[PDB]
Write a protein that binds this ligand. Structure first.
Ligand SMILES: *[C@@H]1O[C@H](CO)[C@@H](O)[C@H](O)[C@H]1NC(C)=O
Ligand SMILES: *[C@@H]1O[C@H](CO)[C@@H](O)[C@H](O)[C@H]1NC(C)=O
Ligand SMILES: *[C@@H]1O[C@H](CO)[C@@H](O)[C@H](O)[C@H]1NC(C)=O
Ligand SMILES: *[C@@H]1O[C@H](CO)[C@@H](O)[C@H](O)[C@H]1NC(C)=O
Ligand SMILES: *[C@@H]1O[C@H](CO)[C@@H](O)[C@H](O)[C@H]1NC(C)=O
Ligand SMILES: *[C@@H]1O[C@H](CO)[C@@H](O)[C@H](O)[C@H]1NC(C)=O
Lengths: 132, 468, 128, 469
């Protein structure tokens, strides 16, 4: 329930941005293993920082459009968010940093994750189940 | 006496060619552990002898030995690999005004120019100054908002040629340098009990991080608020916490306040609510509802009033019956909070028998109200009848409003005057009052004409008689 | 000739291009040396090629209700080149096969690709 | 006599395993050439014996041997490659109602089922019907609009298992089945010489191929038109050709018509333009009114004014007075050049009589129209004296002419007549009330009564009584 306020609702424009991305354009993420399974605190931090890298670069691949909604803008604001999270988290939750291997994802799977990550909040607190 | 541990090689910095061994050996009676650590990575080891058989630029770090009393020593190892001459944590955040480290420590300490470079050809901003350190990174100093999203490169010249590190792209966290701007949808509400109350506040600030809140004037309880937020680019953010009361009860009235609060200041904005149990219509006229006019004269009646909800069927009625459509009605303020109206009634050139009692009525979903005006028009007396009474005198009757005055002249007629009067009773008891006055005929003079004068603040009229 | 066939839904190219990732390589069967000259030794091939290219590119996007989706933008660039690959196979109508051996496919950044697309549209307005 | 060449192998269709040879032998005295051709490729050859050492599925075709007399014989060679079982011209356009070949010819003729399949699960429309031919492709029949952008696959079954070809994406060309829809911005124009006349026509039709033209009524001349066009989805097109005359001259008047011509119909649309050398104002109103003391009366005039009417007003006796007058256009149309103004006179005062006038003007001409409001009144017995020797005089003023009748009998009284010197003097000043002075001699063969003077007028009556003895 902490930091839930840091996630502006520009999150809503992800679906459009996805529609405006070539179904075959493979995006790179350092996918933190088994997150899609559980729990929701064994990764959140890492994935949040990563999504920022990911988002940030993907953002350079576009230029700004005056009239209308550029994927540039959309991404830009997504980036503003994942950063503020990276912060509120490393400022509230306040580990041996070994980074996940890079993986490719279509813009859907990718943003599918992105979305799941923004949900890891709204119910975020301040590592045994991280099993398998 | 207590002394820190001793490590061999007894050097303070050691350099290894990638692919080599690293044997560090701590000699101390109270050995407790080895602690390697580079960027974020961090290891421990319970072994006086630390050994890594085949090195890797990813071993460049600080190996530390700590005693059982909490004492310690430590040598820095550099493992030179021509491929990797940098180790980095492309993550890079910094506060406004505060310094910030570009995480790119060197693998080989012996290099010509450790420096921060312009990313992709361009040049670093003139303003930005920094101070390198092979055991950390380059330390950008006093990161300014304007460095936000800036991408740098860690640079180093080896053998005349300068090499680059992966790219770093600093993100700058603002530092509140002024109070949150805050506003409110409406200034002051007013609703009939049961209606819904809803208002929305708009907090704007350099960062989502503000603190906003809808408190009830003089009270620290918590109010159920729903909100939406946006980002309109760099160092700009807006939030809209909207407060709502479904079906407000009278006791729900009072003031509410929106409060924004960052690391520098506060901002208030209030909005007062006024719930009522039932609607109302109160009236305030111009002057006494008793108007005075004159045949052919004009006159407007104007009333004002509050009304909630908005007024409906308005109209002017003369003697319980509608008449004209020559009356204006209009709000007094045009504000989007006006509850005060005004209605004028234009009576142009009344006809005397046009007097009477004009009323104004207006009503709303609840109460019905009205106010009436008594317009008494004035007229010039009229010699309704001047006859010749029996044995004794002459009688003259005139009609006018107000009370007509009857004075008598006498001398022959261009004529002179002589006063006199006896029986004068103004019968009548609407409007026009009539008066009857006569005067005896025994003057000791003859061969002339007598006149009847009926005076009135408005004018005069008269008739002539004869005598002998 | 045919210049009237090309609608202005072309202006919206600078945008579509702005919305394609600067590294998403578009495949096009570039007709050799068209960029030099002349302007009729290739017009017909490129015009057909473009359609194919644009046509697939269009499949990679989904339709967006509110706004201008690359889909729409492209879908309309497609409608056009198709109509050219029409007026020509009906105005030039001198297709006695002798010039074939379809060009080799080549890769282009959306900007290069649409640059070509643009030059190709210019080829008309002054066509035989 | 002339006879066709003779090719060997004598077979009508030969099948070769990829990687093998294709030896063809034409035997005729007048060998001219060898003619190979597949989808669109086509190779000729001047050698009696055709030979390819290493064949590929792109050799599958029709080798034709032509004589020197214009005769010829030829065999079809299928070169089976388990890799490609299809050769294709992935290009595919088709007109409406026409038939269209899905360019996917076979490599190995001996195949179980040659069929046109839906694309990506989706099933082809139950409507569509086709007829395959391993020497062409599948022939989609009567290609309808609905098949537009439709994608198909050429399917075939070999070894119980069914294989698919690359994807074709049929693009259907509409067949005009109805006339264009043409509309124009403004119906009729009107401007002062010197200004600009620009109007814009909008053609909407199944295709950009429509013909739209701006032709000046009864004139096949070429007008200068600038045009814009758009595509609102499928089989939907919009072109807007805009016509403009910078600084219109008077003769540039007349009608203009927009034309839509397509393989099925025409569409007329005209916009009449009327240029003038200078603005103008015309007025149409009895100009003389009558009333009564106390009565109300409204005066109303109408007019045409171009440009728009500027200062307008009502003046009484060359001076301004009230603001109780409405001014307003008569149609609200966006072509309305006619206006109308009313003047409200509530409960006149009689002395209020006069010549009310209305003035309106534009950037060009000025104008006005005047009204004469004669207000009526009930006679007033201004002076009923007694003449010198012999009679009684009685003057009354009113409007119009106050009738002076005389009564005699004593007074409930009877009436007796007689009239003497009756002269109304007042010509002098303007719109006023007329005064009348009439008297009557007093030589009565009776006495002890009362005489009455009566002043009549269509509005009312007044009177005064005299005496005798
Ligand atoms: C308003 O009155 C109701 C009546 O029971 C009460 O429940 C409610 O708490 C009151 N609200 C306030 C804050 O006065
Ligand atoms: C509201 O009240 C003060 C009035 O002095 C105002 O200036 C300030 O912004 C707000 N402070 C509070 C009550 O938080
Ligand atoms: C006028 O109407 C009022 C009702 O508001 C009534 O009391 C009064 O008697 C009426 N006056 C007359 C004379 O009708
Ligand atoms: C368009 O008008 C008619 C209708 O089809 C046609 O005869 C004519 O040829 C067309 N325009 C011209 C003059 O080519
Ligand atoms: C075209 O002109 C003809 C002239 O006879 C007219 O009858 C027809 O209605 C016009 N077509 C339209 C109205 O589009
Ligand atoms: C001014 O008014 C007089 C009478 O009121 C009229 O005769 C005269 O024509 C007016 N002015 C002019 C000359 O238009």
């Amino acid at each position: 329930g902490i930091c839930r306020n840091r996630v502006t609702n520009n999150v809503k424009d992800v679906t459009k941005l996805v529609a405006n991305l070539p179904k075959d354009y493979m995006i790179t993420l350092k996918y933190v293993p088994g997150m899609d399974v559980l729990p929701s605190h064994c990764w959140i931090s890492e994935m949040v920082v990563q999504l920022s890298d990911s988002l940030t670069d993907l953002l350079d691949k576009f230029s700004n459009i005056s009239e209308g909604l550029s994927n540039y803008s959309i991404i830009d604001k997504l980036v503003n968010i994942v950063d503020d999270l990276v912060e509120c988290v490393k400022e509230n939750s306040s580990k041996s940093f070994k980074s996940p291997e890079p993986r490719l994802f279509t813009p859907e799977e990718f943003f599918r994750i992105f979305n799941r990550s923004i949900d890891a909040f709204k119910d975020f607190v301040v590592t045994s189940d991280c099993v398998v | 006496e207590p002394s820190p541990p001793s490590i061999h090689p007894g050097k303070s910095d050691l350099i290894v060619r990638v692919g080599d061994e690293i044997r560090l050996l701590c000699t101390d009676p109270g050995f407790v552990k080895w602690t390697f650590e580079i960027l974020d990575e961090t290891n421990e080891n319970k072994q006086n002898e630390w050994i890594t058989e085949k090195a890797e630029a990813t071993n460049t770090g600080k190996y530390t030995c700590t005693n059982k009393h909490g004492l310690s020593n430590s040598i820095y190892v550099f493992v030179r690999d021509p491929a990797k001459l940098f180790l980095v944590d492309r993550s890079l955040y910094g506060k406004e005004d505060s310094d910030t480290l570009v995480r790119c420590p060197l693998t080989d300490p012996e290099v010509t120019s450790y420096s921060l470079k312009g990313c992709q050809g361009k040049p670093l901003p003139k303003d930005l100054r920094f101070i390198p350190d092979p055991k950390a990174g380059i330390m950008i100093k006093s990161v300014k908002r304007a460095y936000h999203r800036l991408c740098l490169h860690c640079s180093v010249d080896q053998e005349g040629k300068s090499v680059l590190s992966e790219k770093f792209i600093l993100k700058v966290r603002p530092a509140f340098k002024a109070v949150p701007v805050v506003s409110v949808s409406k200034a002051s509400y007013l609703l009939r009990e049961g209606e819904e109350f809803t208002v929305t506040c708009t907090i704007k600030d350099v960062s989502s991080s503000v603190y906003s809140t809808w408190k009830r004037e003089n009270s620290q309880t918590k109010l159920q608020e729903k909100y939406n937020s946006w980002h309109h680019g760099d160092f700009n953010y807006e939030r809209q916490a909207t407060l709502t009361i479904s079906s407000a009860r009278v006791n729900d009235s009072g003031v509410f306040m929106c409060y924004a609060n960052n690391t520098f200041g506060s901002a208030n904005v209030t909005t007062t609510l006024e719930v009522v149990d039932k609607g109302f219509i109160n009236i305030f006229p111009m002057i006494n509802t008793t108007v005075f006019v004159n045949d052919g004269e004009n006159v407007d009646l104007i009333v004002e009033y509050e009304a909630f909800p908005k007024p409906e069927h308005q109209q002017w009625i003369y003697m319980n019956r509608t008449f004209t459509d020559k009356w204006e009605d209009y709000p007094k303020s045009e504000n989007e909070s006006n509850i005060r109206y005004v209605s004028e009634l234009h009576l142009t050139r009344l006809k005397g028998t046009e007097g009477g009692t004009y009323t104004f009525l207006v009503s709303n979903s609840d109460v019905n109200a009205a106010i009436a005006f008594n317009v008494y028009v004035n007229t010039k007396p009229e010699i309704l009848t001047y006859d010749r009474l029996v044995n004794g005198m002459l009688q003259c009757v005139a009609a006018g409003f107000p009370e007509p005055t009857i004075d008598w002249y006498f001398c022959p007629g261009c004529s002179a005057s002589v006063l006199p009067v006896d029986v004068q009773t103004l019968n009548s008891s609407f409007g026009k009052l009539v008066v009857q006055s006569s005067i005896d005929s025994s003057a000791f003079k003859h061969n002339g004409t007598v006149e009847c004068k009926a005076y009135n603040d408005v004018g005069k009229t008269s008739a002539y008689f004869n005598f002998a």
